[PDB]
Each structure stands twice: as structure tokens, then as C-alpha cells.
Amino acid sequence: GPQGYASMNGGTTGGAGGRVEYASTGAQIQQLIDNRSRSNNPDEPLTIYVNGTITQGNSPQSLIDVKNHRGKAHEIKNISIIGVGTNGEFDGIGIRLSNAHNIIIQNVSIHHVREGEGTAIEVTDDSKNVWIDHNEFYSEFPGNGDSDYYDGLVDMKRNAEYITVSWNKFENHWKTMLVGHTDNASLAPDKITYHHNYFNNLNSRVPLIRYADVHMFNNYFKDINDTAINSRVGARVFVENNYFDNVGSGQADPTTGFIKGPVGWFYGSPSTGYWNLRGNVFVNTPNSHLNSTTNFTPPYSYQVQSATQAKSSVEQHSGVGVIN
Numbered sequence: 604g605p606q607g608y609a610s611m612n613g614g615t616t617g618g619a620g621g622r623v624e625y626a627s628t629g630a631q632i633q634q635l636i637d638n639r640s641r642s643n644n645p646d647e648p649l650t651i652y653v654n655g656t657i658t659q660g661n662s663p664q665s666l667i668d669v670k671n672h673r674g675k676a677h678e679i680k681n682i683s684i685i686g687v688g689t690n691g692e693f694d695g696i697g698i699r700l701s702n703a704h705n706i707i708i709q710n711v712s713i714h715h716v717r718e719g720e721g722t723a724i725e726v727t728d729d730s731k732n733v734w735i736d737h738n739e740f741y742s743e744f745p746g747n748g749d750s751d752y753y754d755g756l757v758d759m760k761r762n763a764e765y766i767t768v769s770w771n772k773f774e775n776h777w778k779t780m781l782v783g784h785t786d787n788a789s790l791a792p793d794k795i796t797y798h799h800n801y802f803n804n805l806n807s808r809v810p811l812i813r814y815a816d817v818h819m820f821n822n823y824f825k826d827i828n829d830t831a832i833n834s835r836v837g838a839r840v841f842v843e844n845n846y847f848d849n850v851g852s853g854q855a856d857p858t859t860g861f862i863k864g865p866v867g868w869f870y871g872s873p874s875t876g877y878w879n880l881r882g883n884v885f886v887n888t889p890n891s892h893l894n895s896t897t898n899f900t901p902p903y904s905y906q907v908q909s910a911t912q913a914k915s916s917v918e919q920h921s922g923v924g925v926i927n
Contacts, residue, residue, distance in 0.1 A: 604616065604734070609734045612731060615734045617648070618707065619683065635651055636672075636679070641672055646681055650685060653684060657693040657694070666719030669698060678702050679701075681705050683709065684698070686711040688924055689924040694714060695714075696716060697724060700726045703733065706730070712740075735757060735767070736770050741774045744775045745777075750777040757771075758780065758781040759783070764793045775803075778808050796818045797820075799917050811835070814838055817839070818841045821845060822917070825850070829869075834876025839899035841881075841901060844882040844910045859871075864888060865885060865890065879896075879898060
């Protein structure tokens with residue numbers, strides 16, 4: 604199971620120990636979710652193995668709607684969506700978790716998502732205990748030069764909490780990852796762990812964090828054009844044993860004055876977030892300015908490699924076709 608925050612609050616097992624299904628179209632995926640929700644046992648664990656290319660053309664809605672059929676006020680629970688080999692592909696259609704609890708999304712590629720929310724995985728409406736593991740997410744960068752043509756790769760909003768994002772590749776994208784969509788503390792997600800991810804050839808938002816407590820360890824950040832970790836409005840991010848290579852423009856942010864780099868306060872929001880920095884390695888990545896502004900340490904046990912050991916493990920084992 605997951606390390607970090609998704610292991611808390613009862614842990615995350617997704618759809619282990621229940622029904623198993625294969626799907627090759629978005630219609631089959633959506634029908635499985637909706638059929639279960641209408642059944643006499645809506646919470647029975649369900650694992651859907653994705654073997655084929657899920658598209659707009661083969662799906663009944665513009666996104667894959669992991670939401671209780673009655674509406675987002677009610678929980679949906681205990682699902683795993685797992686790709687088969689290198690064949691679990693979502694091309695131009697993303698997944699939305701709304702008030703979804705105990706969910707695993709693993710070994711899939713989700714890419715070029717413009718329609719729907721325009722984001723590969725959106726975690727929203729008080730979803731909790733979600734493990735996003737060993738996936739590949741991408742679009743284009745610079746692509747056609749429009750940062751908004753595609754939206755996010757993995758975004759969290761509206762009080763989503765206890766989430767671990769691990770062993771994924773995020774590549775070729777403008778607005779990579781958001782935690783909290785607006786400066787509204789009452790809607791802020793919280794308690795997110797990112798570890799062993801490959802963040803490569805991205806413009807910004809790695810992640811954009813508002814309010815939340817976040818732990819980022821053992822990730823490999825590479826070729827990030829503008830800024831990486833952006834900590835805003837009282838966020839606390841413990842940035843631990845990550846490897847950064849060519850990350851940040853080095854320019855003074857025209858709004859906050861902060862040097863654009865691996866971690867800081869950039870672009871907006873009325874007040875800064877905080878960071879606790881330990882054991883990171885910075886290659887061609889501005890860092891002479893950088894000191895810890897919080898002592899924040901996450902409440903869970905975990906294992907953590909050196910930054911250089913993490914770089915190598917991420918290179919070898921992140922992304923799809925590894926766990927299946």
C-alpha cells in the first residue's frame with residue numbers, strides 16, 4: 604500500500620478484495636461505476652483493469668466520472684483503476700474523483716486532456732484516501748504556446764485530503780499540479796504526499812500549493828522552465844531529499860519578488876506559504892537564497908532514500924509497465 608498521507612485515516616486499499624472487471628472503453632468504465640452505485644451493495648470493492656485506449660469517442664461523458672450516481676453529496680468508495688501492462692491508456696479524457704474515498708489509480712497513461720475539466724486526474728469534493736501511483740501524465744510543452752490549452756495533470760481541490768502521489772511521470776506540460784484552486788481556506792485540500800515522481804519538461808506548478816500541509820520526498824525534478832514548488836497562503840511543504848536539475852528561470856518574480864526556482868512564493872495569493880528544506884540536491888537550479896521557514900514534519904512513518912539514490916530509482920521504476 605501507499606507510503607505517506609494516504610496510509611493514514613484508515614489507509615488506502617482501493618478495490619482490493621472485491622470484484623474484478625476488464626474495460627476497454629470509457630463507456631464500460633462508467634457503466635461499471637454507475638451500475639455498482641445503483642446496486643444493493645454500492646460499496647463492494649471494485650477493481651477495473653484498463654486494457655485499451657479510453658477516449659472521448661468511446662466514453663459517454665467528457666470525463667470519467669468517479670462520483671456517486673445520485674450526486675457528489677454522497678460518497679463513492681473502494682475502487683481501483685489499474686492499467687494492464689503498457690495498455691491502460693486514456694487519450695484526451697481524464698478522470699474526476701468527486702467525494703470519492705479509498706481509491707487507487709495505478710499503471711495508467713493519461714494524456715492530452717483538453718475536454719471535460721481538461722485535467723488528467725482531478726481530485727475534488729472532499730475525496731479522501733486516494734493513491735495515484737505508477738502512472739504517466741503528459742500533454743505538450745511548449746506545444747502551441749497556450750498554457751491554458753490543456754489544464755492540469757493532477758489537481759486537488761475542495762477539501763480533498765489524505766492523498767499520496769507516487770512513482771508517476773509528469774512530463775511535457777504547462778500547468779502541472781494544483782493543490783487548492785482558489786484563495787479560500789475553507790475549501791483548501793490538506794495532507795498530500797508526493798514521492799518518487801519524475802517531473803520533467805514542465806513550465807510551472809510542481810505543485811502550486813495553497814494552505815495545505817504537503818510532504819515531497821525523493822522526487823526528480825528536471826528541466827522545469829519557470830518555477831517548481833510554489834507555497835502560498837500558509838501552506839507548509841517539507842521538501843526532502845529531492846533531486847533538482849535545471850529547475851527554475853532564475854528571474855525575479857514580477858509579483859512576489861522571489862527568485863524563480865525550485866521552491867518559493869510565486870505569481871499570486873495575498874501571503875506566502877512556508878517550506879522546510881532538508882537533503883535536497885540542486886544542479887543548475889537557483890538555491891543560494893533558500894532557507895527553511897517552517898519546521899513542519901509530517902505525522903507518519905516512512906522510508907526515504909538520499910536524493911541521488913532517489914534520482915536513480917525514479918529513472919528506473921517510475922511510470923507505467925513497472926508494477927504490471
